[PDB]
Every structure is written in structure tokens, then in C-alpha cells.
Coordinates of C-alpha atoms and ligand atoms in Angstrom, one line a residue:
Chain E
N1 CA 37.9 81.0 120.7
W2 CA 37.1 83.3 123.7
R3 CA 33.5 84.2 124.7
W4 CA 31.8 86.3 127.3
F5 CA 28.3 85.8 128.7
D6 CA 25.5 88.3 128.3
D7 CA 23.0 88.1 131.2
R8 CA 20.4 90.3 129.5
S9 CA 19.9 87.9 126.6
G10 CA 21.2 84.7 128.4
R11 CA 23.7 83.9 125.7
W12 CA 27.5 83.5 125.2
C13 CA 29.0 86.2 122.8
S14 CA 32.1 86.4 120.7
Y15 CA 34.8 89.1 121.1
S16 CA 36.1 91.2 118.1
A17 CA 39.1 89.5 116.3
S18 CA 41.4 92.1 117.8
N19 CA 40.2 91.7 121.4
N20 CA 40.1 87.9 121.1
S21 CA 43.8 88.0 119.9
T22 CA 44.8 90.3 122.8
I23 CA 43.1 87.9 125.3
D24 CA 44.5 84.7 123.7
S25 CA 48.1 86.2 123.5
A26 CA 48.1 86.9 127.3
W27 CA 46.5 83.5 127.9
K28 CA 49.3 81.7 125.9
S29 CA 52.0 83.9 127.6
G30 CA 51.1 82.6 131.1
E31 CA 49.7 86.0 132.3
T32 CA 47.1 85.8 135.2
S33 CA 45.1 88.8 133.7
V34 CA 44.9 91.0 130.6
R35 CA 43.5 94.5 129.9
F36 CA 41.8 95.4 126.7
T37 CA 39.5 98.2 125.3
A38 CA 36.3 98.3 123.2
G39 CA 35.6 101.9 122.2
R40 CA 35.3 104.0 125.4
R41 CA 34.9 100.7 127.5
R42 CA 37.9 99.4 129.5
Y43 CA 38.1 95.7 130.7
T44 CA 40.3 93.3 132.6
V45 CA 39.9 89.5 131.9
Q46 CA 41.0 87.7 135.1
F47 CA 42.1 84.2 134.1
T48 CA 42.3 82.9 137.7
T49 CA 38.5 83.4 138.0
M50 CA 37.5 83.3 134.3
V51 CA 35.7 86.7 134.6
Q52 CA 35.8 89.9 132.6
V53 CA 35.6 93.0 134.9
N54 CA 34.5 96.4 133.5
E55 CA 37.2 98.7 135.0
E56 CA 34.7 101.7 135.3
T57 CA 31.7 99.9 136.9
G58 CA 33.0 96.7 138.3
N59 CA 30.4 94.7 136.3
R60 CA 31.5 91.1 136.0
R61 CA 30.8 89.0 132.9
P62 CA 31.9 85.3 133.0
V63 CA 34.2 84.2 130.2
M64 CA 35.0 80.9 128.5
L65 CA 37.7 79.4 126.3
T66 CA 36.3 77.0 123.6
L67 CA 38.2 73.6 123.6
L68 CA 39.0 71.6 120.4
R69 CA 38.5 67.8 120.6
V70 CA 41.5 65.6 121.1
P71 CA 41.9 63.5 118.9
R72 CA 40.3 65.4 116.0
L73 CA 37.3 63.8 114.2
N74 CA 37.8 62.7 110.5
Chain G
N1 CA 37.0 55.0 128.1
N2 CA 38.8 58.3 127.9
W3 CA 42.4 57.2 128.7
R4 CA 44.7 55.5 126.1
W5 CA 48.2 54.0 126.0
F6 CA 50.3 53.7 122.8
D7 CA 51.3 50.3 121.5
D8 CA 54.6 50.7 119.5
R9 CA 54.3 47.1 118.2
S10 CA 51.0 47.8 116.3
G11 CA 51.5 51.6 116.0
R12 CA 48.1 52.4 117.5
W13 CA 46.6 54.0 120.6
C14 CA 44.7 51.4 122.8
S15 CA 41.8 51.7 125.2
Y16 CA 41.9 50.4 128.8
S17 CA 39.2 48.1 130.3
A18 CA 36.3 50.0 131.9
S19 CA 37.7 49.0 135.4
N20 CA 41.3 50.1 134.7
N21 CA 40.1 53.3 133.0
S22 CA 38.0 54.1 136.1
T23 CA 41.0 53.4 138.4
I24 CA 43.2 55.8 136.3
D25 CA 40.5 58.5 135.9
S26 CA 39.5 58.5 139.6
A27 CA 43.2 59.1 140.6
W28 CA 43.4 61.8 137.8
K29 CA 40.3 63.6 139.1
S30 CA 41.6 63.3 142.8
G31 CA 44.8 65.3 142.0
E32 CA 47.2 62.3 142.6
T33 CA 50.5 62.5 140.7
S34 CA 50.5 58.7 139.8
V35 CA 48.2 55.6 140.0
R36 CA 48.8 51.9 139.9
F37 CA 46.6 49.3 138.2
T38 CA 46.8 45.6 137.3
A39 CA 46.2 43.7 134.0
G40 CA 47.2 40.2 132.8
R41 CA 49.7 39.4 135.7
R42 CA 51.4 42.8 135.4
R43 CA 51.3 45.9 137.6
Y44 CA 51.6 49.3 135.8
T45 CA 52.1 52.8 137.1
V46 CA 50.6 55.7 135.2
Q47 CA 52.8 58.7 135.9
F48 CA 50.6 61.8 135.4
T49 CA 53.6 64.2 135.7
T50 CA 55.1 62.7 132.5
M51 CA 52.0 61.0 130.9
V52 CA 53.9 57.7 130.7
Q53 CA 52.8 54.2 131.9
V54 CA 55.6 52.1 133.4
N55 CA 55.3 48.3 133.4
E56 CA 56.6 47.5 136.9
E57 CA 57.6 43.9 136.0
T58 CA 59.8 44.8 133.0
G59 CA 60.4 48.5 133.3
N60 CA 59.0 49.2 129.9
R61 CA 57.6 52.7 129.4
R62 CA 54.7 53.5 127.1
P63 CA 53.1 56.9 126.6
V64 CA 49.5 57.7 127.6
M65 CA 46.9 60.2 126.6
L66 CA 43.7 61.7 127.9
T67 CA 41.0 62.2 125.3
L68 CA 39.3 65.6 125.4
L69 CA 35.7 66.3 124.4
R70 CA 34.8 69.5 122.5
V71 CA 33.5 72.5 124.5
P72 CA 30.8 73.5 123.6
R73 CA 29.3 70.2 122.3
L74 CA 28.1 70.2 118.7
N75 CA 24.3 69.7 118.0
Chain S
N1 CA 56.5 74.6 123.2
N2 CA 53.1 72.8 123.6
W3 CA 53.5 69.8 121.2
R4 CA 55.5 66.7 122.0
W5 CA 56.4 63.3 120.4
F6 CA 57.3 60.1 122.3
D7 CA 60.7 58.6 121.7
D8 CA 60.7 54.9 122.5
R9 CA 64.5 54.7 122.2
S10 CA 64.9 57.1 125.2
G11 CA 61.5 56.4 126.8
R12 CA 60.7 60.1 127.0
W13 CA 58.4 62.7 125.5
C14 CA 60.4 65.1 123.3
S15 CA 59.7 68.7 122.4
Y16 CA 59.6 69.9 118.8
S17 CA 61.8 72.8 117.7
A18 CA 60.1 76.3 118.0
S19 CA 59.6 76.4 114.2
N20 CA 58.0 72.8 114.0
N21 CA 55.9 73.4 117.1
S22 CA 54.6 76.6 115.5
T23 CA 53.9 74.7 112.1
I24 CA 52.0 72.0 114.0
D25 CA 50.1 74.3 116.3
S26 CA 49.0 76.6 113.4
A27 CA 47.5 73.6 111.5
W28 CA 45.9 72.4 114.8
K29 CA 44.2 75.8 115.4
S30 CA 43.1 76.1 111.7
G31 CA 41.0 72.9 112.0
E32 CA 43.2 70.8 109.6
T33 CA 43.2 67.0 110.0
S34 CA 47.0 66.7 109.4
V35 CA 50.2 68.7 109.0
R36 CA 53.6 68.2 107.3
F37 CA 56.9 69.2 108.7
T38 CA 60.6 68.4 108.3
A39 CA 63.4 67.7 110.8
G40 CA 67.1 66.7 110.2
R41 CA 66.4 66.2 106.4
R42 CA 63.5 63.8 107.2
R43 CA 59.9 64.4 106.2
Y44 CA 57.0 63.7 108.7
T45 CA 53.2 64.0 108.8
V46 CA 51.3 64.5 112.0
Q47 CA 47.8 62.9 111.8
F48 CA 45.6 64.8 114.2
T49 CA 42.7 62.2 113.9
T50 CA 44.9 59.5 115.5
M51 CA 47.5 61.8 117.4
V52 CA 50.4 60.0 115.6
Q53 CA 53.5 61.3 113.7
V54 CA 54.4 59.2 110.6
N55 CA 58.0 59.1 109.3
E56 CA 57.5 59.4 105.5
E57 CA 60.7 57.4 104.6
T58 CA 60.3 54.4 107.0
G59 CA 56.6 54.4 107.8
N60 CA 57.4 54.4 111.5
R61 CA 54.6 55.8 113.7
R62 CA 55.3 57.7 117.0
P63 CA 52.6 59.2 119.2
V64 CA 52.1 62.9 119.8
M65 CA 50.5 64.9 122.5
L66 CA 49.3 68.5 123.1
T67 CA 50.0 70.0 126.5
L68 CA 46.8 71.6 128.1
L69 CA 46.8 74.7 130.3
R70 CA 44.7 74.6 133.4
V71 CA 41.3 76.4 133.3
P72 CA 40.9 78.5 135.5
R73 CA 44.6 79.6 135.8
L74 CA 46.2 79.3 139.3
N75 CA 47.1 82.6 141.0
Chain R
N1 CA 33.6 69.1 141.7
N2 CA 34.7 69.8 138.1
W3 CA 31.5 71.6 136.8
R4 CA 30.6 75.2 137.8
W5 CA 27.7 77.6 137.1
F6 CA 28.1 81.4 137.4
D7 CA 26.2 83.2 140.1
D8 CA 25.5 86.7 138.8
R9 CA 24.3 88.0 142.2
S10 CA 27.6 87.2 144.0
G11 CA 29.7 87.5 140.8
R12 CA 31.4 84.1 141.3
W13 CA 31.6 80.7 139.7
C14 CA 29.9 78.1 142.0
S15 CA 30.4 74.4 142.5
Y16 CA 27.5 71.9 142.2
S17 CA 26.7 69.3 145.0
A18 CA 28.7 66.1 144.5
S19 CA 25.5 64.3 143.3
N20 CA 24.5 67.0 140.7
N21 CA 28.2 67.3 139.6
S22 CA 28.2 63.5 139.0
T23 CA 24.8 63.6 137.1
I24 CA 26.1 66.4 134.8
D25 CA 29.6 64.8 134.3
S26 CA 28.2 61.3 133.5
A27 CA 25.9 62.9 130.8
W28 CA 28.9 64.9 129.5
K29 CA 31.0 61.7 129.2
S30 CA 28.2 59.8 127.6
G31 CA 27.9 62.3 124.7
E32 CA 24.5 63.6 125.6
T33 CA 23.6 67.1 124.3
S34 CA 21.8 68.1 127.6
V35 CA 21.1 66.7 131.1
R36 CA 18.3 67.3 133.6
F37 CA 19.0 67.5 137.4
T38 CA 17.3 68.6 140.6
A39 CA 18.3 70.4 143.7
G40 CA 15.6 69.1 146.0
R41 CA 12.6 69.5 143.8
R42 CA 14.0 72.5 141.9
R43 CA 14.5 71.5 138.3
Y44 CA 17.3 72.5 135.9
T45 CA 18.6 71.6 132.4
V46 CA 22.3 72.0 131.4
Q47 CA 22.5 72.5 127.7
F48 CA 25.9 71.3 126.6
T49 CA 25.6 72.8 123.0
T50 CA 25.4 76.3 124.5
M51 CA 27.1 75.7 128.0
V52 CA 24.1 77.2 129.8
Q53 CA 22.0 76.0 132.7
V54 CA 18.3 76.8 132.5
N55 CA 16.4 77.1 135.8
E56 CA 13.1 75.3 134.8
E57 CA 11.1 77.2 137.5
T58 CA 12.3 80.8 136.8
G59 CA 13.6 80.5 133.3
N60 CA 16.9 82.2 134.3
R61 CA 19.8 81.1 132.2
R62 CA 23.2 80.9 133.9
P63 CA 26.5 80.0 132.1
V64 CA 28.3 76.8 133.0
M65 CA 32.0 75.8 132.7
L66 CA 34.0 72.6 132.9
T67 CA 37.2 73.1 134.8
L68 CA 40.3 71.6 133.0
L69 CA 43.2 70.1 134.8
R70 CA 46.8 70.7 133.5
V71 CA 48.3 68.1 131.2
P72 CA 50.9 66.9 132.2
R73 CA 50.3 67.2 135.9
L74 CA 52.8 69.3 137.9
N75 CA 55.0 67.6 140.5
Ligands
51X101 O1 52.6 44.6 128.8 C1 52.7 44.9 127.6 O2 53.7 44.5 126.9 C2 51.7 45.8 126.9 N1 50.5 46.1 127.7 C3 49.5 45.2 127.9 O3 49.5 44.1 127.6 C4 48.5 46.0 128.7 C5 47.2 45.6 129.2 C6 46.5 46.6 129.8 C7 46.9 47.9 130.0 C8 48.2 48.2 129.6 C9 48.9 47.3 128.9 C10 50.3 47.4 128.2 O4 51.0 48.3 128.1
51X102 O1 63.3 59.8 112.7 C1 63.5 59.1 113.8 O2 64.0 58.0 113.8 C2 63.2 59.8 115.1 N1 62.8 61.2 115.0 C3 63.7 62.2 115.0 O3 64.9 62.1 114.9 C4 62.9 63.4 115.1 C5 63.3 64.8 115.1 C6 62.3 65.8 115.2 C7 61.0 65.4 115.2 C8 60.6 64.1 115.1 C9 61.6 63.1 115.1 C10 61.5 61.6 115.1 O4 60.5 60.9 115.1
CL103 CL1 26.2 86.5 134.2
CL104 CL1 30.4 95.4 131.3
CL105 CL1 54.8 47.4 128.7
CL106 CL1 61.6 69.2 115.7
CL107 CL1 60.5 57.7 113.1
CL108 CL1 16.8 81.9 139.2

């Protein structure tokens, strides 16, 4: 359900199942931010700005949370 | 017509008129905690902190909901 | 504790038990159109296409709601 | 001011003008899959199926977001 934007290709991208679960668990727990890793890369998702920050370079990639329709369609 | 109120007599969610829906939705978007509107000789207050509509003439309380559209939109 | 049902006897939204809230929310996140649960030896079905809980013994329909977290989060 | 686009140069989400926000939000509420708007003569298309704004003069694609207000509202 979480996505990050890639400015090189101009497209939204999905996280791995593990990183998506780490982000979503912190989101549901009321945390304002969450740290996660992808190989040698280290990131912080800042929920107050909806931005992923690369801890090493400071590169910012916007993030989004997909929303399910309420009510659900038949 | 994104706001609805539940009718326990029929067991269904009901839409508001375009005018009353707009009054409710403008107060919602403006950050107000409640909003009043009129319909059929009755004044109602929608309490956004509880998502309940109160009939100011009778005191009767009916629940309300805000419909949400999918993000992203489907093709 | 994100799902609620309206109780017209008390005039208030009511929380589900942690177990029933998890059962409902798991079906909601899986894309199901409905979910079954039990409470106090009674069987209920939540219909997500209408946002209504149906008492399987009496047929009584009560509305349900899903609480929504603000996006972005406040600091 | 509920819609935002991300400015990669400053690294911040940005609000639209009241007029462009209204154009975008009206198309969103009408169920349209995309909407065109202008900032002066500069042309843009917001694609709701991808949540991307396309600058129709440079071709640059910027992501967009819809802010969501908490339900129920806090007191
Ligand atoms: O007064 C009642 O008994 C039920 N009732 C209406 O007739 C009505 C009309 C427009 C908006 C809300 C309501 C509502 O709750
Ligand atoms: O059966 C009824 O009369 C009312 N009722 C309950 O006592 C109850 C308990 C837990 C979840 C839902 C319900 C519900 O609708
Ligand atoms: Cl970007
Ligand atoms: Cl990065
Ligand atoms: Cl009423
Ligand atoms: Cl329960
Ligand atoms: Cl019941
Ligand atoms: Cl540009």
C-alpha cells in the first residue's frame, strides 16, 4: 500500500513486502517517522511531510499511501 | 454528494440534497468542529468530532459518514 | 481500534473488541466485500459495500464506520 | 488547499493556487480520470490514475497527493 516516487523515470514505485510492512506498522502505531534498510541503503520515512529521506545523502523521495474506497464497490 | 446519514427506520444510508451536502462539506474542509443545516422545518447539527447528526427539534441522533474515493483512481 | 458500529439505543458509536476489530480489518485490507464475526453468542455480518452490520438472528441493520488517520501526520 | 504537488528542487510538497486546487478537486469529485489546468498560460495535466502532474511545456512529471483530514475530527 506504500509507494515512493522515482524522479528519473517519473513514476511511483512499490516497496518490498518487508519494507512496506515496516513502514505500515509504524504508520498504524502513531509514529511520526520510521527507519528501514534496503541492502546497504538506509532511509527514514517522515510521515509529517510524506517524504523518504536517504540517511547517507539526504536525497528526498516523496511517498504516498494508497487509499481504499469507502464504501467498497460490489 | 459525498456525505450520508443513516436511517434506522429503513436500514439504509441516505444522501443529502446538493445544497445541504455543500453546507456540510464546506464546514468540513474549513476545519470547523460542527455545522448546522436546515431541511423540512427542522434544523440539524452535524458534529464532526463524533460523526453524528443531531436533530435540534427532537434531540434524535443519527450517524453520518463521509464517502472516500479510491487513491489512485482506477482506469 | 479503528472500526465502530452505531448503537441507536445509546445514541453513540461503539468500538469492537480487539479480536473483532482485527477480524473486520483483516477482511477489509484483503479486499473482501463482507466479513463474519460473533459477539456475545450472536452472529453478525459486516457488509462493506453498504457499511452496514447485519444481526443474523434478527435481521437488524446497524451502520459501521472506519476511522481515518490524517495524511500527512501532524508533528 | 487539499491538493499538493512535490517540488524536487526544494524537496517539499507545494500547494496549488485556490483556483487550480478547485479545478483539480472538482474533476476529482466528478470521477474524471484526468484534469487540465493552467498557471497563467503554462499548461498542466493531473493524471489521477497515476497521481502525477505532467508539465505540458517541459514534459516534467511531478507526483501529486490529496491531503486527508482525520475522521472523526479532533476537538
Ligand atoms: O428528521 C428525521 O426524522 C429524519 N431526517 C430527515 O427527514 C432528514 C432530511 C434531510 C437531512 C437529514 C434528515 C434526517 O435525519
Ligand atoms: O445485538 C444487538 O442487539 C446489539 N449489538 C450488540 O450487542 C453487539 C456487540 C458487539 C458487536 C455488535 C453488537 C450489536 O449490534
Ligand atoms: Cl521527486
Ligand atoms: Cl535515495
Ligand atoms: Cl432525526
Ligand atoms: Cl465486539
Ligand atoms: Cl442488532
Ligand atoms: Cl518543469
